[PDB]
Amino acid sequence: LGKFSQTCYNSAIQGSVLTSTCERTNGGYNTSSIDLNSVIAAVDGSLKWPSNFIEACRNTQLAGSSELAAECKTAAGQFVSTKINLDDHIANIDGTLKYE
Amino acid sequence: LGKFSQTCYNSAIQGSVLTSTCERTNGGYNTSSIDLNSVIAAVDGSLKWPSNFIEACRNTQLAGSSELAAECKTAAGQFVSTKINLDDHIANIDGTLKYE
Ligand code: NA
Ligand code: NA
Ligand code: NA
Ligand code: NA
């Protein structure tokens, strides 16, 4: 996976955004950016790649009126029960669900 | 923050997606969805809210050709040095930077 740096140049980071100028298949280049804020996490002082839950969890369900429940895989490899209250961060903003 | 469930109904979870029918300011309702995959993480079997790095880190820089370096806050409250190789997951796809 990855390996952008091998065929890109003029790379820069500002805040959470990576910008680089990269080779196209046909020759020539294109400059683009990617905002990494939501794809890199800071965990106890260490930068980590994301741990999106669907890649580690099964049997997602709504529990009650606001809880997301699932069975998720531990580092040891077993699935354990877990839940999280969606009311912590999901808001009704004038009729539309939004994260805050 | 959050609290959608207080003024929404007919909520459902399928996979990583929450769907609900929520009250608008003017009365009446709107049905919407939100894909939580990238806003909820699975960490060692436990669902957690995101830890986007910019909310915990300072002095982001490009180190060399492909590393993101920063100083990030530990649970204890001190900033420590950390880095992550963007080549792990950022690809040049025909001239455009993409996460994979
Ligand atoms: Na690829
Ligand atoms: Na499943
Ligand atoms: Na709000
Ligand atoms: Na800063």
From Swiss-Prot, chains A, B:
One Pfam family cited in the UniProt record for this chain: CVNH
Q: Which GO terms describe its biological process?
A: regulation of defense response to virus
Q: Keyword RNA-binding, does the record have it?
A: no
* Application of this enzyme or protein: Overexpression of this protein to provide quantities adequate for medical use as a topical microbiocide has been attempted in a number of systems including E.coli, Lactobacillus jensenii, the yeast Pichia pastoris and Nicotiana tabacum; see PubMed:20162270 for a review.
State the source organism's domain of life. Bacteria
Keyword Disulfide bond set for record? yes
Output one GO MF annotation: carbohydrate binding
Provide this UniProt record's keywords sorted from A to Z: Antiviral protein, Disulfide bond, Lectin
Disulfide pairs here are 8-22, 57-72
> PTM details?
Cleavage, or reduction and alkylation of the disulfide bonds results in the loss of anti-HIV activity.
In the record, the note on similarity to other proteins reads: Belongs to the cyanovirin-N family.
Function text: Mannose-binding lectin.
Remarks, anything else?
Its activity in situ is unknown, however it acts as a viral entry inhibitor, inhibiting HIV-1, HIV-2 and simian immunodeficiency virus (and some other viruses such as feline immunodeficiency virus, measles virus and human herpesvirus) infection and replication. It prevents essential interactions between the envelope glycoprotein and target cell receptors by binding to carbohydrates on viral protein gp120 and possibly by other mechanisms as well. Addition to cells must occur before or shortly after virus addition.
Q: How does it assemble?
A: In solution exists as a metastable domain-swapped homodimer which very slowly converts into a more stable monomeric form at room temperature. Under physiological conditions it is unlikely that the dimeric species exists and indeed the monomer is more active against HIV. Interacts with HIV-1 gp120.
Protein's UniProt name: Cyanovirin-N
Please tell me the species this chain comes from.
Nostoc ellipsosporum
